[PDB]
Assembly symmetry: C2
């Protein structure tokens, strides 16, 4: 039995609102049957436009990387209930510590948010066989700052850095493994009820072609999609969560 | 008479040790005629590697988005003396306020760093005529937190968001128009001495072919290069700063 899957979109383009607007209408006209929570995280400056225009009942809006208490509070007052934290990338590029993202997860949860925490290893780490370590260490740090009930507001996205906008995607087995690994750790550290209920999304070069197969994996509960979420094929990715 | 130009390189590719290593060898062996300060901002994860292989006397290492008192101290002990603050992108994508980037610039400068502060408007702001008000508001906010002597540690990069990784470079006159506003503002509010010494760099889809004509503009002092800094043409960009 799987928990509700999630199909999350990461928006970034910097040359219109024309395309976003048309995608939003495409999403607003799409028919979705199965139980799935879709999420669209546009740029901060497109948040207002997106909120008003996006009307599909199975889509919600998420903010990204609100590095501040006042940032969290104003987003929540504005009607935003989701936030995505791009830790894998920020750890690799700027040296953001696991403790700092753990603190931000705890802060976001306490502020009323549903938090999608992006954890993952570098190419060099995956190279030397450290996916296991690196990934569980980030999850361990997060657990240290979360109460058991906090996990109902948390979603884990396994987004390995080497998969992010490179065209390289983890295989349905190579993702199931690190996912199964996360769930078992959570099970034995926090509880079986929390571990089973926990959505563990896969992110990194996902597209309409691979979505179907990755989702068939027992411990994959949806996707975090960047480049492919700016295209009509996202509709396919959603459909693939059944 | 233009102050010393800067050619700044921002690295972010993942599967890169060999590729980066090749570039460094390439840079190390390059002969650079004129007076130019070259800067390389690798991802945190390749800091030590770059610091061990780069040796050209006209090159320094920079950290990107160092956001922590504890993290500057680390950087400072590791021998890194330059930092680049990607504010234009964080403002657009995450809502980062002008006040927060001003606090960071002041923090970095108080700690002995040279700071490249990246300011710029969004596509929407550019299409609606708001570039001037938006850019000038960003520089004024940063100024408020600086003493006159601190400007020696400051470098401004005009980095319009709609030009970052989109291929849409600003025209020579577009960049000169905004650089001129910036410099006019500083000369009037701070001093003509400070304004004439200030390096105002342009960033956004800079490459080997468009660099030359950009640097010919009176108030352009150099470049911030993303995707073209990973390629051999970065050499061309450097040569164009004369």
């Amino acid at each position: 039995s799987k928990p509700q899957p999630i199909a999350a979109a990461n928006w970034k383009c910097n040359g219109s609102q024309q395309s976003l607007s048309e995608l939003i209408d495409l999403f607003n006209s799409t028919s979705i049957n199965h139980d799935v929570q879709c999420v669209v995280a546009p740029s901060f400056v497109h948040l207002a436009m997106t909120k008003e225009r996006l009307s599909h009942p199975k889509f919600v809006i998420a903010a990204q990387n609100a590095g501040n208490a006042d940032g969290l509070a104003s987003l929540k007052d504005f009607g935003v209930n989701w936030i995505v934290l791009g830790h894998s990338e920020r750890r690799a590029y700027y040296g953001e510590t696991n403790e700092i993202v753990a603190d931000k997860v705890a802060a976001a949860v306490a502020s009323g948010f549903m938090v999608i925490a992006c954890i993952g290893e570098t190419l060099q780490e995956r190279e030397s066989g450290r996916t296991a370590v690196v990934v569980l260490t980030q999850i361990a740090a997060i657990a240290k700052k979360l109460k058991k009930a906090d996990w109902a507001k948390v979603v884990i996205a396994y987004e390995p850095v080497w998969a992010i906008g490179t065209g390289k995607v983890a295989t349905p087995q190579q993702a199931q493994e690190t996912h199964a690994l996360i769930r078992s750790w959570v099970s034995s550290k926090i509880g079986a009820d929390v571990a089973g209920e926990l959505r563990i999304l896969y992110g990194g070069s996902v597209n309409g072609k691979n979505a179907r197969t990755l989702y068939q994996q027992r411990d994959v509960n949806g996707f975090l999609v960047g480049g492919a979420s700016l295209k009509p094929e996202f509709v396919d990715i959603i459909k693939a969560t059944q």
